[PDB]
Amino acid sequence: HLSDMLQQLHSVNASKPSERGLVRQEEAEDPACIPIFWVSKWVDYSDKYGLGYQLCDNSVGVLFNDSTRLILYNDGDSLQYIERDGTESYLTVSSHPNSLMKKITLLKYFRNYMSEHLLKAGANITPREARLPYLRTWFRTRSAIILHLSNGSVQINFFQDHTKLILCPLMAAVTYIDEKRDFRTYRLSLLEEYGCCKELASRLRYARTMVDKLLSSR
């Protein structure tokens, strides 16, 4: 999926979309391409345990430093464990093995921290009407955190102004959450034709570099 996104992104940025004679950004909206999932909270404890996160459906997950993943569903009980090689197992907080006891308490520790401290991003957006993804990989730069979900989506949160990109290669689309927390979803092909403001074009050039890095990290 990332090769599809990199090309979608490569075409748009080739358009010079902020250079249109008359930018018509709103003409590039497609409200039915809104994503189903995005990362609504995250905690980087990677010096000790790994990266904990919340998805917009109130499920939570951890990508441990040993490259394993544990997800808790929003029912608060069902777990999915994903090993380094991608092998997937279902367990529950009720009925689980003892070998995961430490990782489950780390998840609960992350879960508790996020509910006590953190604002849920996009809480006013209803997701589109889907298999629950996990965090495949992530990295931080000095200006943003980059989050790659198992369903193909790439999210980039920008630290300075709290703006966020959600890129979906299945829709050839991007969602931009701006400084005022207003969200707009765009078909990237339409952003090529109609153009966009300099701020968004700046973010999309950055996004291309980030997707190159994700692709090269495979």
């Binding site: 909270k41 995250w42 905690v43 980087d44 401290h117 953190l118 604002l119 991003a121 949160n157 630290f159």
Partner: peptide, 7 residues
Amino acid sequence: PISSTPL
């Protein structure tokens, strides 16, 4: 930061 936007 080491976590997302706090309340």
